A and B are shown apart, each in its own frame.
With several copies, the nearest count.
Chain A
């Protein structure tokens, strides 16, 4: 069907005008991506050093980077070799090229989730509604293998199997990993991944509002000084008759 279903507005902790992101939720959503979403989706523009000072310390992010193996080279014989990862390494590819993703995902290409709440209408609301909106198809419509019904996906036939259920991973802080909690955490993490400057942007905006609230009446007062020399000027016509 060509009819579309808009996702609703959720009360996010960063929804407000000066409201920053909850960094524990970004840490939990990074764990959700690492354990679930990294098998199919890529994060080509995010590195491990971006996690320092946001969700993890330097040594925690160093351990996270060294858990994986990165292709590197050329060696002195001219051959490629695996090495442990470091902080300057970006997040590992699931597939070496998109045609391998097409072959491994029944013809569908799992998109790079680095701008996925910036490239979709709804933002993180759309991601939450897509992850928590898998349901049985209604009567009249039928779907084949490799397809799953999702009313928030355009066309209502998504090639992605439902990846999140109750207790799909174990959190580091002991939070109960329900489907809604895991989806909210990964939506917060994807919002941070699309907008890493978000808290700094809102702090800059707060300083800008304070500075403009200081400076606009003062510049208005200077203008009205230099113009109130003219705005009380009185004229008189005195013809000699």
Chain B
């Protein structure tokens, strides 16, 4: 019922493609991969990173608070 031939109505659209044996599999891989990755990470880093930053701060604070919770209070054994 839902196969190729009856998916959508498309008019006046031209597509050009070439054979995979005709073109390279890695056309300028590093020289255009690096700026594209940098663009994607600079468009998403402010939405993604600060929650995990404050997870790191909460994790370190909780671990150190537990460590000083196990620490001996020097105020005890001071009266006698």
Contacts and interface: CB of A to CB of B under 8 A. Distances in A.
- Do A and B come into direct contact in the complex, CB within 8 Å? yes
Contacts of B23: 228-229, 232
Interface residues of A, number: 18
Given A221-B25, A228-B27, A233 B70 contact: no
Main secondary structure of the interface of B (DSSP, over half): loop
A229 B18 contact: yes
B70 to A, nearest CB: 6
Contacts of A3: 70
A228 B12 contact: no
A237 B12 contact: yes
B23 to A, nearest CB: 6
A233 B12 contact: no
B20 A229 contact: yes
Nearest to B71: A3
A225 B20 contact: yes
Interface of A: 2-3, 221, 224-226, 228-230, 232-240
25 contacts: A221-B25, A224-B25, A225-B20, A226-B20, A228-B23, A228-B25, A228-B27, A229-B18, A229-B19, A229-B20, A229-B23, A230-B17, A232-B18, A233-B15, A234-B15, A234-B16, A235-B13, A235-B14, A235-B16, A236-B13, A236-B14, A236-B16, A237-B14, A238-B12, A238-B13
